[PDB]
Amino acid sequence: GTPFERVELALDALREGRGVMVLDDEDRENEGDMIFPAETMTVEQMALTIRHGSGIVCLCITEDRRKQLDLPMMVENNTSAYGTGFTVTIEAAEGVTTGVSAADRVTTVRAAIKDGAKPSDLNRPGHVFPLRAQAGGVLTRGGHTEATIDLMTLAGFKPAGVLCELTNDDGTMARAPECIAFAGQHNMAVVTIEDLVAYRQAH
Amino acid sequence: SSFGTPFERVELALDALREGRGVMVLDDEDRENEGDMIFPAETMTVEQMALTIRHGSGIVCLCITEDRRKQLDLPMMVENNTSAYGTGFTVTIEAAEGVTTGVSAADRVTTVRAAIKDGAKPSDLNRPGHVFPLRAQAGGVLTRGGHTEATIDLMTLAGFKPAGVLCELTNDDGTMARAPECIAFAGQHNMAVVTIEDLVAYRQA
Ligand SMILES: [Mg+2]
Ligand SMILES: [Zn+2]
Ligand SMILES: [Zn+2]
Ligand SMILES: [Zn+2]
Ligand SMILES: [Zn+2]
Ligand SMILES: [Zn+2]
Ligand SMILES: [Zn+2]
Ligand SMILES: [Zn+2]
Ligand SMILES: [Zn+2]
Ligand SMILES: [Zn+2]
Ligand SMILES: [Zn+2]
Ligand SMILES: [Zn+2]
């Protein structure tokens, strides 16, 4: 397909309760992140993500939601190679045990994204990793974090999505051909950040 | 499914660590009821890291002492720790050299090695990152019966640097492995099984 078509197909997939495989630039991370809307991701989708992802399952959120939840950025002097926007980590205050099962990570995501969520609904630290997206989305920063928020908002959801990088069992990160094969195995749409940037520049 | 005394289980685990094998550490059934795969930070292989990500939560942690935390200038992640188990997460880390994105098994190992190197400085680690240090409480399992303290105590008793990598064993269906699954897993992977209770008994003696 074309770039705009891949974006459109990705929005349909998110609306249908399917995941999307998001590939960033080859000259950047060259990684594929599986993403789901925070509002609809299931425990089975979370199990899938832990099984075949890095297991570092992230919750992409806006600056306003970060402030609503009172989640400081993890560090002041961000020296990460890619400037990744990790906040302090989180666990649901209620409805979990140790916080790390697929079910507990989903409970934590739902507590964080609920309308009216308050800081006391989350304990810290925890086993879910929120990432704060920059305003302007992929028009500001071409990361998976912004890409996730932009796809959610374009699909009609709250600007809140769950992401994890796809990993091969031998410990190497999946490259684009592996990400596309995996997307086929799990009926996910595939889209690139480059597609998304072009789409938003036009639209 | 158990054999022998607590003391032998501990000694078997020390041998396993020296031999380059993992240890499966079970905490109290009334605490987390979880088994963590553990390896010395010094000798853990890329293959072992890949095994840990594949079978574990993927939240692979590096147990360190307070002295090492200070040496690396790693703040505790939160001032007011409200976690269910009071887990000692510091700010997260990535090697400043010799990695790409930080997340591959190879890159996580590189990061662990950078953090534990003799003479490691704060500038050897970028923050935040894909490896999660856990700071052990003074007194080890005699103060806090956690996987973090168990790891440090085991490495210490085995003769290693007080630094160990851990991750909780996860079933493929996303539920956490309980003792029977952890014991079966450890058997299949030639990891020595030991309980925090065993280790408390050993250290008190
Ligand atoms: Mg735990
Ligand atoms: Zn159009
Ligand atoms: Zn699967
Ligand atoms: Zn599978
Ligand atoms: Zn705002
Ligand atoms: Zn844990
Ligand atoms: Zn990314
Ligand atoms: Zn599937
Ligand atoms: Zn295995
Ligand atoms: Zn990552
Ligand atoms: Zn240096
Ligand atoms: Zn534990």
Swiss-Prot record, chain A:
Lineage in the entry?
A: Bacteria, Pseudomonadati, Pseudomonadota, Gammaproteobacteria, Enterobacterales
Enumerate the PANTHER family for this protein.
3,4-DIHYDROXY-2-BUTANONE 4-PHOSPHATE SYNTHASE (PTHR21327:SF38), GTP CYCLOHYDROLASE II-RELATED (PTHR21327)
Q: Which reaction does it catalyse?
A: D-ribulose 5-phosphate = (2S)-2-hydroxy-3-oxobutyl phosphate + formate + H(+)
How is the co-factor bound, per the entry? Answer: Binds 2 divalent metal cations per subunit. Magnesium or manganese.
The name on file for this protein is 3,4-dihydroxy-2-butanone 4-phosphate synthase
What keywords tag this UniProt record? Lyase, Magnesium, Manganese, Metal-binding, Riboflavin biosynthesis
Pfam families this protein is in?
A: DHBP_synthase
Checking InterPro entries in the record gives: DHBP_synth_RibB-like_a/b_dom, DHBP_synthase_RibB
What are the names of the required cofactors? Answer: Mg(2+); Mn(2+)
| Protein residues bound to Mg(2+) 1 | 29
Query: What residues does Mg(2+) 2 bind to?
Result: 29, 144
Please give the organism.
Salmonella typhimurium (strain LT2 / SGSC1412 / ATCC 700720)
Annotated GO MF terms: 3,4-dihydroxy-2-butanone-4-phosphate synthase activity; magnesium ion binding; manganese ion binding
The reply to whether Protein transport figures as a keyword in the UniProt entry is no
